[PDB]
């Protein structure tokens, strides 16, 4: 029932994500001058280095907040891809599935730890 365990679990999951070839387009912020369609359609840019930096700064209070930012990477990618005919689309779908598969136990364990704390 460790309330703090999620943080190292998220650090390790981000390490797996960065090693995966599918994360390459999502590792760093998009240059808004080079990709103006992203600039116009994306209200809140997000990328995995910003997620990792936020986590390391101690600026996430829960893994649910980290999960919201990672999900934003994928929803921004979906808004950017008008069809299935681009590698960004293919990579985003697979990386999202991998992330969701691995974050589920992190969220379950954290929510269980909070319920135990408040029991
Ligand atoms: O390097 C790039 C250019 C680019 C455009 C749009 C999206 Br979503 C991700 C990325 N990554």
UniProtKB/Swiss-Prot annotation:
Top-level taxon in the UniProt lineage: Eukaryota
Cell compartments where the protein resides: Nucleus
Tissue expression from the record: Expressed in myeloma and epidermoid carcinoma cell lines.
PTM sites of type Phosphoserine: 90
Residues carrying Phosphothreonine: 44
Residue ranges annotated for the Bromo domain, each copy included: 1-106
Its job: Probable regulator of the insulin and insulin-like growth factor signaling pathways. Stimulates cell proliferation through regulation of cyclin transcription and has an anti-apoptotic activity through AKT1 phosphorylation and activation. Plays a role in the regulation of cell morphology and cytoskeletal organization.
Subunit structure: Interacts with IRS1 and IRS2. Interacts (via bromo domain) with acetylated lysine residues on histone H1.4, histone H3 and H4 (in vitro).
UniProt disease annotation: Chung-Jansen syndrome: An autosomal dominant disorder characterized by developmental delay, intellectual disability, autistic features, anxiety, hypotonia, obesity, and dysmorphic features.
Protein name: PH-interacting protein
Native organism taxonomy: Eukaryota, Metazoa, Chordata, Craniata, Vertebrata
Name of encoding gene: PHIP
Whole sequence portion shown: 1316 to 1434 of 1821
């Amino acid at each position: 029932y460790d309330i703090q365990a999620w943080k190292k679990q998220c650090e390790e999951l981000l390490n797996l994500i960065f090693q995966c070839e599918d994360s390459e387009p999502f590792r760093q912020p998009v240059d808004l001058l080079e990709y103006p369609d992203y600039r116009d359609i994306i209200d809140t840019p997000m990328d995995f280095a910003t997620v990792r930096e936020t986590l390391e700064a101690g600026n996430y209070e829960s893994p649910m907040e980290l999960c919201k930012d990672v999900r934003l990477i994928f929803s921004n990618s979906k808004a950017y891809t008008p069809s299935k005919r681009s590698r960004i689309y293919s990579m985003s779908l697979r990386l999202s599935a991998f992330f969701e598969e691995h974050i589920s136990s992190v969220l379950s364990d954290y929510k269980s730890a909070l319920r135990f704390h408040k029991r």
